Design goal:
The structure is cut from a larger assembly and holds chains A (249 residues), B (47 residues), C (22 residues), D (132 residues) and E (110 residues).
Chain A: H1 2-9, E1 46-50, H2 51-59, H3 71-76, E2 90-94, E3 107-108, H4 114-123, E4 127-128, H5 134-141, H6 143-149, H7 164-168, H8 181-193, H9 206-210, E5 227-229, E6 234-236, H10 241-248
Parallel strand pairs in A: 1-2, 3-4
Antiparallel strand pairs in A: 5-6
Chain B: H1 2-8, H2 37-43
Chain E: E1 29-30, E2 40-45, E3 49-54, E4 57-58, H1 61-76, E5 82-85, E6 90-94, H2 98-108
Classes of the chains: A alpha/beta (249), B mainly alpha (47), C mainly alpha (22), D alpha+beta (132), E alpha+beta (110).
Chain lengths: 249, 47, 22, 132, 110
């Protein structure tokens, strides 16, 4: 680096030596002389994640492959930008990147493409859709702030009747779908592509992959109505029977 | 003719037919900017 | 074998080859 | 595991089993994939070719094989294999899925003056062949 | 951001490949971005001038320009029109040629 050789020879610089960069400041006009003398909200704002965008995150290890894909982990990994002021209500995927995304992993997305569901299932991944209230989702993305407020974990909300058919639909793989149809449905999807269906039970981590939280339960780790000892880095569970009635209500 | 080509001409029988042109493939755009599904539906096979 | 050497496409110049073939 | 009135077992009393969602149904119906040979050419759309030997294939019943061969002779290679390809989508599985579906349709759907003229022209040649 | 995990086989199925080893001994070294990506950005100005910019160039920029000019002259069909900002250590090239340069950069071993 011959540039460094120039620096060593040069004498110490001073405050007065400072000079503005070339073209940094344009000229200004002042009247001192003659120069200037004389003279849609209801529809969910679904935010998609592309399969190609999905693949690189796994490739870079931005999201742990062992851990099932979780929207919060994507937020923790800065995968997508969500603004509560934008009032984003939905999450989905981009059809692009189907043939550049060869991977299998458990994942839950508010919205999943029917074609995409089979492809990841063909690879061996597990896909389902869960409903997070826009207010609850904003709380979900930022857990620490409501702990500072002192708010306790509330029960997860349910979709409006307009979106109930989607979640209840078996093909949509919503948590409101009938589990009895899932075995039949999974076989049907395999036949559609024709690939040999790999049973999830065969997987060693089947229980981890297939684990699902209650519809009322916002967090798989934390049951609804729970409290967290943020100061003590611990979890606090209510012991009042009336609180259980409150949760039941 | 097979006898002539093989016995004395000592060569494989020549077989010819009209040569068809290479298949025509549409060139889809990598990023369909401002492209809906209804418009793409007509262009794509599914419709 | 020299005889085996043959062009990829035939060269038929008979005017009625297509007409006779249909 | 936390449970509530909205838990899967309570929501669907009939499917209270743990594996009611994780089960696999038995084997039903259907082209044998093992028999088929699939080759993918990346023309982006991944061109997919599915080719099988129509006559030798035993899963197809013989009457269907003959009808398929006559109907789609143009799609049979000189080796006798039935070749069909799909390059109409950006998804490789879609091309495979399209190829498989066409095969299924062919199985289900399958399940003269020219000769006289050839005699006439041959007969004409013999009569035309008269300079003795 | 964590460093990329080691992969058994490169290039990665997506297409990502870490910098080639051994690194080239050329006078100019091009470092990867903090995301471990090639520091090439497609830029358009005035709505009609397509441009590509290389920023993280270390060493002799002139040597890189000579090689870049030689590489792009056949593909472009003539000597590329470029402006060198030595103060910022950046090179600006008219037209979009990131794909060819990115592949060419891989050949250099960066």
């Amino acid at each position: 680096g011959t540039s460094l050789d120039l620096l060593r020879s040069l004498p110490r610089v001073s405050l007065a030596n400072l000079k503005p960069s070339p073209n940094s400041r344009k000229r200004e006009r002042r009247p001192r002389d003659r120069r200037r003398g004389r003279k849609h909200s209801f529809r969910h704002q679904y935010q998609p994640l592309s399969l190609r965008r999905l693949q690189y995150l796994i490739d870079l290890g931005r999201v742990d492959p062992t851990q099932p894909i979780d929207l919060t982990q994507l937020v923790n990994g800065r995968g997508v930008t969500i603004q509560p002021l934008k009032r984003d209500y939905g999450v989905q995927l981009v059809e692009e990147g189907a043939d550049t995304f060869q991977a299998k992993i458990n994942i839950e997305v508010q919205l999943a493409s029917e074609l995409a569901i089979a492809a990841i299932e063909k690879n061996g991944g597990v896909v389902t859709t869960a409903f997070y209230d826009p207010r609850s989702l904003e709380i979900l993305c930022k857990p620490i702030p409501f702990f500072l407020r002192g708010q306790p974990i509330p029960k997860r909300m349910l979709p409006p009747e307009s979106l109930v058919p989607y979640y209840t639909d078996a093909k949509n793989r919503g948590y409101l779908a009938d589990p009895a149809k899932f075995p039949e449905a999974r076989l049907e999807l395999a036949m559609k592509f024709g690939y040999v269906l790999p049973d999830i039970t065969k997987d060693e981590l089947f229980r981890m992959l297939s684990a699902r939280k209650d519809p009322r339960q916002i967090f798989f780790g934390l049951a609804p109505g729970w409290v967290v000892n943020m100061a003590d880095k611990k979890i606090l569970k209510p012991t009042d029977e009336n609180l259980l009635k409150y949760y039941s209500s | 003719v097979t006898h002539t080509f093989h016995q004395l001409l000592d060569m494989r029988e020549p077989v010819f037919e009209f040569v068809r042109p290479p298949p025509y493939h549409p060139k889809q755009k990598r990023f369909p900017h401002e492209q809906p599904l209804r418009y793409l539906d007509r262009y794509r096979d599914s419709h | 074998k020299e005889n085996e050497a043959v062009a990829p496409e035939f060269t038929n110049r008979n005017p009625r080859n297509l007409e006779l073939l249909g | 595991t936390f449970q509530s009135i909205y838990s899967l077992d309570k929501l669907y009393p009939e499917s209270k089993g743990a594996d009611t969602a994780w089960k696999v149904p038995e084997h039903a119906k259907y082209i044998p994939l093992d028999r088929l040979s699939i080759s993918y050419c990346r023309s982006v759309n991944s061109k997919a070719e599915v080719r099988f030997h129509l006559a030798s294939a035993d899963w197809i019943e013989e009457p269907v094989r003959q009808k398929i061969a006559l109907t789609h002779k143009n799609k049979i290679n000189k080796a006798g294999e039935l070749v069909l390809t799909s390059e109409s989508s950006r998804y490789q599985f879609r091309n495979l899925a399209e190829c498989l579906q066409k095969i299924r349709d062919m199985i289900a759907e399958a399940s003269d003056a020219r000769l006289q003229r050839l005699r006439i022209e041959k007969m004409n040649r013999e009569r035309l062949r008269q300079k003795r | 951001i964590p460093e990329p995990p080691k992969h058994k086989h490169y290039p990665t199925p997506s297409g990502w490949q870490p910098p080639r080893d051994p690194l080239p001994s050329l006078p100019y070294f091009v470092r990867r971005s903090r995301m471990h990506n090639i520091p090439v950005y497609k830029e358009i100005t005035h709505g009609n001038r397509q441009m590509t910019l290389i920023r993280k160039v270390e060493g002799d920029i002139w040597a890189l320009q000579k090689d870049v000019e030689e590489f792009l002259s056949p593909l472009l069909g003539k000597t590329p029109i470029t402006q060198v900002n030595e103060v910022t250590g950046t090179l600006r090239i008219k037209g979009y040629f990131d794909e060819q340069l990115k592949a060419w950069l891989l050949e250099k071993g960066f």
